[PDB]
Amino acid sequence: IINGYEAYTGLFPYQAGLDITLQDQRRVWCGGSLIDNKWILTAAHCVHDAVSVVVYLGSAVQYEGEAVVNSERIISHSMFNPDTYLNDVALIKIPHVEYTDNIQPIRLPSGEELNNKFENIWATVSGWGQSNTDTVILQYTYNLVIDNDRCAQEYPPGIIVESTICGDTSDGKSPCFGDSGGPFVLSDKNLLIGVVSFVSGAGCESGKPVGFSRVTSYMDWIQQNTGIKF
Amino acid sequence: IINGYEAYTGLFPYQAGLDITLQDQRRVWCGGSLIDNKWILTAAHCVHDAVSVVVYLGSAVQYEGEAVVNSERIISHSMFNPDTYLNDVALIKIPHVEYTDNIQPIRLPSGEELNNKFENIWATVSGWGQSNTDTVILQYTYNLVIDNDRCAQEYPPGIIVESTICGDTSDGKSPCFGDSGGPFVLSDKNLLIGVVSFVSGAGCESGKPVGFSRVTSYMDWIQQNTGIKF
Amino acid sequence: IINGYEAYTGLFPYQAGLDITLQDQRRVWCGGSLIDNKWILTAAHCVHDAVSVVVYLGSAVQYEGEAVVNSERIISHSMFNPDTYLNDVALIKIPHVEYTDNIQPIRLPSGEELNNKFENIWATVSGWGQSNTDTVILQYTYNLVIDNDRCAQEYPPGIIVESTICGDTSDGKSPCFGDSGGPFVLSDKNLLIGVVSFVSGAGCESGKPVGFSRVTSYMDWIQQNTGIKF
Amino acid sequence: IINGYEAYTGLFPYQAGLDITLQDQRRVWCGGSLIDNKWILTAAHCVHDAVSVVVYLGSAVQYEGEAVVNSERIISHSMFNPDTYLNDVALIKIPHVEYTDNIQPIRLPSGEELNNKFENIWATVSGWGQSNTDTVILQYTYNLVIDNDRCAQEYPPGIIVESTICGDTSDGKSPCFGDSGGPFVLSDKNLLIGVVSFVSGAGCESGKPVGFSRVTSYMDWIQQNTGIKF
Secondary structure (H helix, E strand, C coil): CECCEECCCCCCCCEEEEEEEECCCCEEEEEEEEEECCEEEECHHHHCCEEEEEEEECCCECCCCCEEEECCEEEECCCCECCCCECCCEEEECCCCCCECCECCCECCCHHHHHCCCCCCEEEEEECCCCCCCCCECEEEEEEECCHHHHHCCCCCCCCCCCEEEEECCCCCECCCCCCCCEEEEHHHCEEEEEEEECCCCCCCCCCCEEEEEHHHHHHHHHHHHCCCC | CECCEECCCCCCCCEEEEEEEECCCCEEEEEEEEEECCEEEECHHHHCCEEEEEEEECCCECCCCCEEEECCEEEECCCCECCCCECCCEEEECCCCCCCCCCCCCECCCHHHHHCCCCCCEEEEEECCCCCCCCCECEEEEEEEECHHHHHHCCCCCCCCCCEEEEECCCCCECCCCCCCCEEEEHHHCEEEEEEEECCCCCCCCCCCEEEEEHHHCHHHHHHHHCCCC | CECCEECCCCCCCCEEEEEEEECCCCEEEEEEEEEECCEEEECHHHHCCEEEEEEEECCCECCCCCEEEECCEEEECCCCECCCCECCCEEEECCCCCCECCECCCECCCHHHHHCCCCCCEEEEEECCCCCCCCCECEEEEEEECCHHHHHCCCCCCCCCCCEEEEECCCCCECCCCCCCCEEEEHHHCEEEEEEEECCCCCCCCCCCEEEEEHHHHHHHHHHHHCCCC | CECCEECCCCCCCCEEEEEEEECCCCEEEEEEEEEECCEEEECHHHHCCEEEEEEEECCCECCCCCEEEECCEEEECCCCECCCCECCCEEEECCCCCCCCCCCCCECCCHHHHHCCCCCCEEEEEECCCCCCCCCECEEEEEEEECHHHHHHCCCCCCCCCCEEEEECCCCCECCCCCCCCEEEEHHHCEEEEEEEECCCCCCCCCCCEEEEEHHHCHHHHHHHHCCCC
């Protein structure tokens, strides 16, 4: 997060930290959200060629958690497109973790929240990605969600689609690399509206909108692959 | 490093820490060796699809350094093969750093050292890869370099080639994920003989050899690309 | 607030900003909390010799509000002691303001929350007092509440009493001058637990605890002087 | 200033902005005049119970300055009377500031100017006190200095004394709360003749005279305390 603030343990009980080992032996960090005792939602670009993930839950300190579990299964959206970031969602199945003061699930949109585009709302994004700081402590910031038409002007033709939700970064506050897969939340409603997907090619301090996977567009996929009806 | 010893600043003044941003926006960690005031040597598998790298020099603490510079260019070996890890070597051009007590170059082989296979010598591996502890301090271990014929037996056919050098990990002291690109050095002679390239398909705690790029096999490529003679 | 973060309009809908004119003609700034359509809770040291207060509601920008009203009555606790800061609470009666997305009351402790000392809880304090920054934007930070016995060791004998609630500032994050009267809130419960009362004589960056009026100790006084049973 | 004109940086290079912290911890704003590289002249009613002051020099924006220094000492007039505002003058010692285009001293009266009562001249008042607009830019206005006998009639007995100088505000252009301590100057002669001291009990928009400390009555006190001759 660039120009973010430090969270304490317990501020964002749904935040997951993912230490990912890939097929080519590299170690990747991404964020994710606890959506169920057995499930983490993250981005497909984080884990589509992963071999294993260690999931950290319940601490603001990177690589610490009061629950550290290993993934049992990784489900990346079959139609994820690497080149456009279309369908950039994935599910990590974990061993049942018991909720706690520090570990709690985020709510997913139901009912008519499924028809809300959330324009002009301030939402919270959090993660341990590149920051201007030193810190190993979970950071967060607020980005206002803008409408898709305004957002589509900022990127090549075809990148911003119905299933993308963009956040404005023109105050210089932004997700940055390593924040991928992280939660974009309507705090007041404890609602997950987006999964961090992509930053502009111009970089994290460009003032360009950040693209997120719009969670209402993937609630069928989630329902269906987890077998849980939210 | 699994079951290594804890280093401290100044112990390994040639060690570079590399925070890599890939073309797909993921954040990767690898190590490297300072070989000149403007050049880092590392693995092609770390950076072959990289867009920029922050280089940390002179501190044993991960993401800390008395010099923190950004890559000016990345030359990856054009014949690198991802599937076999053949020709796994890359160069990061950086802005001229001045050597201090904590930042010094490692010698590269030359003359008759170019003909030495270094069989059955203890060499030192260092890095911030997966250990048994969640630690941010640089770790190191000593591994015995074995002969290629002995190493080859431990791998698929054709993985161990003339340009591979192997270190025995049968005491369970091993490089692991994240140590990629790191230096394999003859401490007494302050000589770089290998760059960490690949762990066994069996993982890190299997007692199996680790392969490294044999630096003596790439000294031409290094002088061609850097423009300097060693 | 020192080392605080910026709020946006709507983050803290209960925050009041008070532009106070005193009996000696000086202009003082303090914060306060909207506890009812007609009532603001603040500190007695802010307003005990005030003549009028302009109350700003509904904006993070200082001296702006979507409701700017003038006080009708100021009620400072009759037993406020200037020298020890004992009983440092006051009520400002305002013209009925209609709640809004941006203007909402904070809850006051009821039931057995009246018996909770709130030790070891992270709470949020906010205001437009001295900061290290430039900003005219409402700032906030988090301070952990410590127990009174630990807190009493940090001040002269007799300052910390049953009706004081202290917040720890040893990470360098603190209320500072101008934050007086401001809210100390359990965000999760939308609960007002303290009113900013005093900073150490050593100043805002001393690492000493900050004293607040413990709101459970004044719920009778509030009930009684507002005539509202919370 | 009610109904004043908007200044800009460099227009009033002698104007100081004072952010005062009182002994009771409240944050107060007053203005002052730069009279030497190490001295601010202001009102005793602003700082007589002050503990420290941040001094803003060289910017028309409130809490901005090309020089921002902290008070080294505050000398308040020992005979100041709060109730009558008698002897309302104070000195803030600051670290030597170098005069620039935006920071310059104002001349103090001397020789025969010490005998001039300055009746019926237009002088300029400036400050960041209450205006009709919520603005952070320095405001100014011209007020006609009237004779003490005429001023006295507009106040209680004994408030207007030999050391008071009054400015007429009957066009509704008036200093107001927050302008305290500010300069009252003969622009054409760049001469300081008054320090804003008190507004009428009727308020700022009443058309009543404003009292100022007559600087010619305190030129001895100023040289005694600063140690400099004018």
